[PDB]
């Protein structure tokens, strides 16, 4: 059984250097033709290939990132390290390392190369956020209005993830939509949480927001304005 | 470099259906192509290697064929765990490219979004910023287009949006879009509009308000 696992800092600041380690078990980077590669996935985006290293020590890099990447192996520790320099916000992504089989051998003779055509086992992935932001609590603002009515709370400018939002201390669940946060160009996150109700219920509505990182709890009652 | 284009980018289906996803390469990649299935929150999982070989432990309903520039993955009888995003990967040329992915989600009847526009709170305005949010609630299919207009000027580069995951009961999606402006710019205009295009809407729907109107 082959397993891989990524480790490194969850948070990194722009211009800094990011070092990611892939520790694995079940194979050796001294085994014939084996490879270990790195692939990343920005939130909501496609997979992007970064680099790979083989047991005979040949290395290859994405041409778009070549100047900022270094991949290396430590055979005796069963680890592969990928160093990315000068990171910027667009480098925020989940980073995965993965195993690549070498050709099948028969009495130590390569006879099948078809198994090298895939990365067959992947690590769970490690989430890395690139922001110069310091820990900071959200500002919470009201969002106020088939014949459904909508209202919500805009949880703005906080760092880092995550934040939790519930409605009426947990009693309101139907019609609730809490969207995934977006990382603003400022380096702070922002999210909305809304709830749809029969245009008659306008019943009271309060969003309970909690950002553990900054010890910031806020309850904000939201109503249909006009005094 | 080499381009790998997946089709369709998104696909709706129901348990028991037969689906086929295709991947086309800009130059021939021989048989060096792999297919993966990735479920939300998890790493991609290898299904098919070398264009058509079934990876060990992978269920037989998955099948891959093709070589050169055109490949296909077919799942013969879709199971609930197959609602996910699929990717193809080329390993003939460096860099070892991935396709854009194809999202497979639960099919349900077309439903237009209920649209709502929210002006910025007076509380936010006092801090100097103005957020205008637009909500597209419970729609299907997933693709939707939101266009912000301020006093009829098309907005660009000053909004961000996020979409919920498919609802497990509804099978619909919801989308939130935030237009952000300084309090000053905000004050220099009157009509804030959120224009929405979607398959379930005969023509675009616009929700708007005039700033300061009381």
């Amino acid at each position: 059984r082959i397993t891989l696992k990524e480790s490194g800092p969850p948070l990194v600041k722009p211009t800094q250097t990011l070092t990611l380690t892939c520790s694995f078990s079940g194979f050796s980077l001294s085994d014939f033709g084996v490879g270990v590669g790195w692939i990343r996935q920005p939130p909501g985006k496609a997979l992007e290939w970064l680099a790979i290293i083989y047991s005979d020590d040949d290395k290859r890099y994405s041409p778009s990132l070549n100047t900022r990447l270094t991949i290396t192996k430590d055979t005796s520790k069963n680890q592969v390290v990928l160093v990315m320099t000068r990171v910027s916000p667009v480098d925020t992504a989940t980073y995965f390392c993965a195993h690549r089989r070498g050709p099948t051998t028969l009495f130590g003779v390569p006879i099948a190369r078809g198994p090298v055509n895939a990365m067959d086992v992947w690590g769970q992935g490690i989430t890395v956020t690139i922001s110069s932001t310091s820990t900071k609590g959200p500002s919470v603002f009201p969002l106020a209005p088939g014949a459904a009515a909508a209202l919500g709370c805009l949880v703005k400018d906080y760092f880092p993830e995550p934040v939790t939002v519930s409605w009426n201390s947990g009693a309101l669940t139907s019609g609730v939509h809490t969207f995934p946060a977006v990382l603003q160009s400022s380096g702070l996150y922002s999210l909305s949480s809304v709830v749809t109700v029969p245009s008659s219920s306008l019943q009271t509505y309060t969003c309970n927001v909690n950002h553990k990182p900054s010890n910031t709890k806020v309850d904000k009652r939201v109503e249909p304005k006009s005094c | 470099a080499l381009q790998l284009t997946q089709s369709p980018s998104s696909l709706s289906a129901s348990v028991g259906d037969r689906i086929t996803i295709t991947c086309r390469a800009s130059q021939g990649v021989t048989s060096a192509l792999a297919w993966y299935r990735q479920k939300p929150g998890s790493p991609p999982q290898l299904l098919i290697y070398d264009a058509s070989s079934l990876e060990s432990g992978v269920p037989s309903r998955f099948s891959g064929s093709g070589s050169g520039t055109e490949f296909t993955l077919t799942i013969s009888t879709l199971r609930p765990e197959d609602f996910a995003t699929y990717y193809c990967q080329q390993l003939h040329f460096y860099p070892h490219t991935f396709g854009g992915g194809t999202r497979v989600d639960v099919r349900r009847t077309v439903a237009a979004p209920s649209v709502f526009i929210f002006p910025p709170s007076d509380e936010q305005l006092k801090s100097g910023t103005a957020s205008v949010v637009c909500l597209l609630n419970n729609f299907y299919p997933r693709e939707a287009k939101v266009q912000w207009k301020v006093d009829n000027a098309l907005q660009s580069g000053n909004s961000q949006e996020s979409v919920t995951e498919q609802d497990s009961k509804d099978s619909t999606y919801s989308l939130s879009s935030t237009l952000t402006l300084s309090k000053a710019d905000y004050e220099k205009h009157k009509v804030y509009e959120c224009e929405v295009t979607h398959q379930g809407l005969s023509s675009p729907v616009t929700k708007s308000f005039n700033r300061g109107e009381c």
């Binding site: 490879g35 190369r113 | 060096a32 040329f93």
Partner: peptide, 7 residues
């Protein structure tokens, strides 16, 4: 260029 195990 070409993959390792190609040719």
């Amino acid at each position: 260029e070409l993959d390792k195990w190609a040719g």
